[model samples]
Target: MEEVLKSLKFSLFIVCTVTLTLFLMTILTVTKFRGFCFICYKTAQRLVFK
Candidate 1:
């Protein structure tokens, strides 16, 4: 495949990893550390989806 495509996928992979980490973090915190994660999750989604 193309190197550019690989790079793009890898970049998104990293973003998704961060997103997942936040999800797990949120789940654990589910208990202030508030919307920072939510905003980050949204940012991650935007980057990953686009």
Candidate 2:
């Protein structure tokens, strides 16, 4: 049987993984990629509000 919920579960799994990766990368070397994490966070706020 096709499951819609399972699709969303995997979507969020990748979302968290990508976000965390950017965060750690930013922290390691902040000269660049500083706003990369911040931008993703801001995007999430507007995204989830929907």
Candidate 3:
């Protein structure tokens, strides 16, 4: 029971971290008021996923 709870907590933590990071990054990218280099960044992203 304790082990199961611990695993669940860890998984939830990972999911939250990934979700938050993606959300924040999406906001930043869309707002683009920050002057990000999307071409370079997207090239890197494609390389990563491809």
Candidate 4:
């Protein structure tokens, strides 16, 4: 039971991460940030992966 719950939680995390990455990519493609956007995005990725 515990292992099943942990697997479920990890799957949820993976889904959320992919969704967030897609959303960010869409938003980034629409706006210009004078080169700061990429840095900010990388930071966010590190945060999420961490």
Candidate 5:
């Protein structure tokens, strides 16, 4: 019984860690893509002006 409890706790910890990592990665990817789009827009405007 104790062994089962220990294994369950370990699995939960692993799941939590994976969830947090994925969440952080998603936020980072979104922010990076947003910045990339903004930069592209600025470059396009400059090209149009020229």
Candidate 6:
């Protein structure tokens, strides 16, 4: 019973850490993609005007 509890606690910790890491990475990816798309949009507008 004790070993089971210890393993459960460790598993929970690992899950929480993984969740946080993935959440951060997702936010970073979204921001980067937004910036990239905005740059592309400006370039397209310039090309169309010219």
Report the C-alpha lDDT of model 1 over 1-50, residue by residue, as the tens digit. Answer: 58877798668868867887888888867644476768778889989996
Query: lDDT (CA) for every model shown?
Result: 0.77, 0.78, 0.78, 0.81, 0.86, 0.86
Compared with the true structure, what per-residue lDDT tens digits does model 6 show for residues 1-50? 88988898678878877988998999998989978888888889988996
lDDT of 3 by residue, 1-50 (tens): 88988898678878867988898998877777455566667678988996
The number of the candidate with the highest lDDT is: 6
- Model 2 bad stretches (over 4 Å): 1-32
lDDT of 5: 0.86
Residue-level lDDT of model 4, residues 1-50, one tens digit each, is: 88988898678878876988898898887676756778888789989996
Regions more than 4 Å wrong, model 3: 1-13, 33-50
RMSD to native, candidate 4: 10.5
Task: Give the TM-score of each candidate.
Answer: 0.32, 0.32, 0.33, 0.31, 0.37, 0.38
Off by over 4 Å in 1: 1-12, 32-50
Model 4: per-residue Cα lDDT at residue 27? 89
User: On residues 4-46, what C-alpha lDDT tens digit does candidate 5 reach at each position?
Assistant: 8889867887887798889899999898997888888888998
| Model 4: residue 7 alpha-carbon error in angstroms | 14
How would the candidate models be sorted by TM-score, starting from the highest? Answer: 6, 5, 3, 2, 1, 4
